[PDB]
Design a protein around this ligand. Structure first.
Ligand SMILES: CC(C)(COP(=O)(O)OP(=O)(O)OC[C@H]1O[C@@H](n2cnc3c(N)ncnc32)[C@H](O)[C@@H]1OP(=O)(O)O)[C@@H](O)C(=O)NCCC(=O)NCCS
Ligand SMILES: CC(C)(COP(=O)(O)OP(=O)(O)OC[C@H]1O[C@@H](n2cnc3c(N)ncnc32)[C@H](O)[C@@H]1OP(=O)(O)O)[C@@H](O)C(=O)NCCC(=O)NCCS
Ligand SMILES: [Cl-]
Ligand SMILES: [Cl-]
Ligand SMILES: [Cl-]
Lengths: 124, 122
């Protein structure tokens, strides 16, 4: 299942959920377009932040985002399908670090991010 | 200077000058995650929007190329956020914007740096 793990601010469909590795997909719709015709930076960032929270949960912990760095490599356009992949690269006592990639249907990398998460407790 | 950008998270304009834009907003429930905090993407979007405004204030259209953000203190229901964006580098091809988010108690809530890639004259 894994619906209801987090509050959904930007819609996505769950693809796979495993320890330290979560994959979801979404489609770029009108709501996310800026006036330049691109998926806005905050939309792409939120998809990555959401998945970083899911990845922390997948390691067995609640955590808050402490710091994040994101690169926008290629624009997302109306109708694009985005595959968002989050992988834990450091599963620490106090911090988790998550690498996130966002890829389109042409397998071009749209964005990449690193999230540093501060652990607040053991899950459920 | 409303009208400059598409608004994804609401804000009220406080001041708009060349290289320096300030806006304000209130944290409402729709932005709260299950931990009761304004979610990271909501804060980031406020910062990304003001970085767009700052780039426009310098005379240029730009797209976000890279951004780093630190979440220093959580935003809570009812908090008033002051978002201040300052161009620290007004370059030919890139603009760099230093963004600070503070609360009513004057505590620093978040700090971000946006690297904007210039696409043309506004
Ligand atoms: C920053 C850092 C300490 C975060 O720790 P973490 O995410 O909890 O990761 P770990 O679980 O692997 O713990 C690393 C060490 O920090 C300690 N630590 C973790 N959380 C701690 C906390 N809350 N308070 C005190 N120590 C803590 C652990 O006990 C562990 O100590 P050990 O070496 O005796 O086993 C860790 O990522 C790190 O050591 N990074 C390298 C920092 C570095 O070398 N910087 C450049 C040179 S200064
Ligand atoms: C990265 C950087 C080049 C971006 O350029 P910018 O935002 O356009 O900034 P500026 O307008 O001040 O231009 C800086 C230089 O880059 C050149 N430049 C700007 N845009 C360019 C472009 N599109 N293509 C080729 N050159 C360009 C300018 O001509 C200027 O060179 P000049 O000293 O001969 O006049 C600039 O911020 C910089 O020089 N940063 C320092 C990089 C550094 O020292 N890194 C560590 C050591 S390698
Ligand atoms: Cl690419
Ligand atoms: Cl826009
Ligand atoms: Cl406040």
């Amino acid at each position: 299942n894994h619906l209801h793990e987090i509050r959904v601010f930007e819609n996505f469909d769950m693809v796979s959920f495993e320890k330290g590795h979560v994959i979801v997909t979404t489609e770029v719709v009108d709501k996310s377009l800026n006036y330049y015709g691109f998926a806005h930076g905050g939309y792409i960032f939120t998809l990555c932040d959401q998945i970083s929270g899911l990845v922390s949960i997948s390691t067995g912990f609640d955590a808050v985002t402490l710091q994040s760095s994101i690169n926008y490599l290629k624009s997302g356009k109306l109708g694009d399908t985005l595959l968002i992949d989050g992988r834990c690269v450091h599963d620490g006592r106090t911090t988790k670090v998550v690498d996130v990639t966002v890829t389109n249907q042409l397998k071009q990398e749209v964005a990449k991010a690193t999230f540093t998460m501060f652990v607040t407790g053991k899950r459920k």
